């Protein structure tokens, strides 16, 4: 059941160098007298690892919740075995299952449960002089446990219930690693007689257990036994004591290692391949010794930093202002059409104008048409009542749709409209606008009908002059300025887009970035797409030529669409790294050559040599570098 621990005086956690520590047997395979390469989660060599304390001098003890990352390397130098085990999980709060280890002299209890872990998880351990023993008085680790799914008891560990002193005579160290719902554990124990810290020498952890737990892990926390000694009040204001233990945490990560297995089937030495250039050389040769010489070992390669895209100036804008800002619009029965072709259409000036009362598009979203292309666009335009703007859409009906202007049911254009009673309304009405009130039949899509002859309303066969059942087919609108909004004039434009087998000629504008030079960049010049270093040029193309090619028929120059300048393209496709070694019998220092790159360091014909001094004194060649240049080990 849960309690708290006093919030405290403390110091920040320290760091220490891991040296060679934290190697473990990757596989249950016997291999003897052999060097084997493997890519696995390891603690990389010489890593700084966090050092934590558990000391009552004041009151600095350091068991936060910590990340698990890819996996944990843990170590302890021994005390009262103050570390009792660990909890691992995600939410820790019963609602997600978590793994508990507790490592008691009675039982190594291993449990997965819906543990409700505390504000401060610990074992309350009291010196029961009542019965001449220390004992746990209190499981202050959790409030409740439920749905456990797994439990195990292993044999009582090399760790004890009493206020003992291992006094750093032993180093206990572990790897914890969760993969595919299998929680692996590894460990080793080792006598030490250093003062403190991780020792230099090599050792391998053996497998300790694997638990098929399946549960989510993200975080962990170390569990401590806290000394409610008889001098303490036995409360949680101050009725506890921390002892004086120390523990270390490092993290695994993906690394390639080379392991030396001896005759007895034991790992005895290792190389972290990614550490330094000699480690990469040993890992390349699959050997722990390297003879005097030069070894090709890796490839250098530069990556593009930016993408530029660049297209000719935006200039030939389509005539929309001549349609929308026109002075005289048509009567709807005799609607105008204008045909738009061979231009850059910037629809943005339409679709985010605030002026229009209606704006909507069918088969196309405004979020796409500024990057779309068409053979032609038609703009149809006319004036109608505010009510009738409803009917200018697919599948509509009534006098305007059926006798004046019919859209296809599968239309792919836009309808735009705005109120006007300024251009096109005055006292007595402007009667200059008309519509068909009568026809024998409905229009087909985009039909027009200017025909002006008397509509015979069925009965009374009519000899071409108006009368009863025989009406003139057009009516004129009463566009008074004081009309209600449904009877105000509205100017309308319908933009119909189309595609045929003819090439596209109306298209949205193309954006250009700035033009950048002397960096490796990705680029797109007017559709010509690539990656390289752009620089000015001495080439002289003919006025119509756009890009150059070499004798191998690959692109080596280009013209800028917006300034007509010629640019050379050069590849950043470098290669080759080599390590120069006096032999490991002689020394562990090395020099490195980058095979052909503009940068001690020392540029040469054969690329830039790094890490060795150039010297004017000639000698015979110890190790050959490039173009009459050699390297040697000297005072």
């Amino acid at each position: 059941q849960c309690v708290n621990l006093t919030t405290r005086t403390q110091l920040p956690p320290a760091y220490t160098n891991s040296f060679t520590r934290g190697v473990y047997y990757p596989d249950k395979v016997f291999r003897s007298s052999v060097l084997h390469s493997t890519q696995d989660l390891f603690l990389p060599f010489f890593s700084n690892v966090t050092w934590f304390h558990a000391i009552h001098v004041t009151k600095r003890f350091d068991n936060p919740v910590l990340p698990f990352n890819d996996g944990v390397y843990f170590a302890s130098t021994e005390k009262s075995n103050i570390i009792r085990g660990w909890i691992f999980g995600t939410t820790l709060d019963s609602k997600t299952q978590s793994l508990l280890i507790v490592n008691n002299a009675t039982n190594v209890v291993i449990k997965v449960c819906e543990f409700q872990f505390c504000n401060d998880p610990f074992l309350g351990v009291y010196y029961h002089k009542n019965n001449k023993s220390w004992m746990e008085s209190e499981f202050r680790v959790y409030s409740s446990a439920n749905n456990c799914t797994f439990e195990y008891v292993s044999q009582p560990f090399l760790m004890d219930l009493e206020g003992k002193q291992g006094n750093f005579k032993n180093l206990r160290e572990f790897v914890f690693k969760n993969i595919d719902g299998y929680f692996k554990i590894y460990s080793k124990h080792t006598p030490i007689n250093l003062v403190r810290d991780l020792p230099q020498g090599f050792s391998a952890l053996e497998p300790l257990v694997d638990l098929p737990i399946g549960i989510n892990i993200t975080r962990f926390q170390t569990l401590l036994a806290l000394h409610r000694s008889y001098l303490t009040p036995g409360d949680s204001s101050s009725g506890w004591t921390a002892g004086a233990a120390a523990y270390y945490v490092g993290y695994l990560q993906p690394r390639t290692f080379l392991l030396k297995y001896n005759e007895n089937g034991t790992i005895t030495d290792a190389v972290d391949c990614a550490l330094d250039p000699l480690s990469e050389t040993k890992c390349t040769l699959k050997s722990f010794t390297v003879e005097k010489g030069i070894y090709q070992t890796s490839n250098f390669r530069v990556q593009p930093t930016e993408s530029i895209v660049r297209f000719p100036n935006i200039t030939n804008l389509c005539p929309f202002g001549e349609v929308f800002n026109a002075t005289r619009f048509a009567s709807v029965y005799a609607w105008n059409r204008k045909r738009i072709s061979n231009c850059v259409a910037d629809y943005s000036v339409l679709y985010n104008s605030a002026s229009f009362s209606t704006f909507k598009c069918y088969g196309v979203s405004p979020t796409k048409l500024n990057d779309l292309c068409f053979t032609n666009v038609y703009a149809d335009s006319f004036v109608i009542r505010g009510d009738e703007v409803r009917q200018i859409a697919p599948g509509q009906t009534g006098k305007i749709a059926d006798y004046n202007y019919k859209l296809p049911d599968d239309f792919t254009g836009c309808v735009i409209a705005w109120n006007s009673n300024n251009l096109d309304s005055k006292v007595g009405g402007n009667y200059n606008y008309l519509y068909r009130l009568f026809r024998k039949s409905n229009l087909k899509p985009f039909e027009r009908d200017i025909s002006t002859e008397i509509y015979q309303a069925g009965s009374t066969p009519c000899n071409g002059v108006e009368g009863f059942n025989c009406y003139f087919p057009l009516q004129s609108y009463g566009f008074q300025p004081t009309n209600g909004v449904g009877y105000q004039p509205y100017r309308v434009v319908v933009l119909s887009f189309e595609l045929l087998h003819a090439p596209a000629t109306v298209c949205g504008p193309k954006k250009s970035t700035n033009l950048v030079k002397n960096k490796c960049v990705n680029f797109n010049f007017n559709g010509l797409t690539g990656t390289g270093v752009l620089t000015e040029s001495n080439k002289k193309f003919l006025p119509f030529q756009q890009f150059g090619r070499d004798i191998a028929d690959t692109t080596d120059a280009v013209r800028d669409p917006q300034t007509l300048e010629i640019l050379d393209i050069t590849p950043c496709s470098f290669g080759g790294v080599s390590v120069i070694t006096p032999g490991t019998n002689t020394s562990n220092q090395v020099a490195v050559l980058y095979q052909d790159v503009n940068c001690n360091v020392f540029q040469t014909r054969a690329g830039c040599l790094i890490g060795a001094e150039h010297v004017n004194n000639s000698y015979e060649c110890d190790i050959p570098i490039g173009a009459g240049i050699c390297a040697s080990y000297q005072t």
Partner: antibody
Amino acid sequence: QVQLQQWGAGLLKPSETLSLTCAVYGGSFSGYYWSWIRQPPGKGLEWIGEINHSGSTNYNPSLKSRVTISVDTSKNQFSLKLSSVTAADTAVYYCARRWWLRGAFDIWGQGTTVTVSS
Amino acid sequence: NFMLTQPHSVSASPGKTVTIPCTGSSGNIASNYVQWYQQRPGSAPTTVIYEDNQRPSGVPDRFSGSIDSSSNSASLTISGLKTEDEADYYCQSYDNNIQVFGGGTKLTVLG
């Protein structure tokens, strides 16, 4: 992709001035409509006002009298001031993007609570 | 000026289908695009219909928009209700340099 993160003074008292900032990651102010919307506790959304593409401003006539909205492109940040606050200004406030004048509220800031209390 | 109105609440049993109406008033709803946002409690809204018929990427095809100028109304149909559909739904549209929202409808799936 684009993120909006917002912050400001969540607790006020009557007749003070409210002030929020919203800042954009992975995107740029210039091309889009940027807008403030509020939601009183257990009530429908109310649109306050907006910046258009290129940074001119438009406000709801019911709040026009006591609202101000402004950008600093050097921070990728924009902001709302609402003066003379009363209990009725208690709400959650969101910033949001719109691609074009009549288009959707495309992406939203995480929302921030404001309590105006004496 | 122009207002969208919605029923305050809607409910039906899971696996069934419902319509939420959004009625235009003082102007014509068909004249500009309509959007529907879902807000699940304690979070920012999200779009489910982004022009009168159009459904965003990743939105279940259970969600389906519609409009008619004859009722002066839009409506959202959710077909095959699930536990996760229980939320507020707001319609929205541009009017006259103003974005207008409906009052929002609570949908519950009738467990």
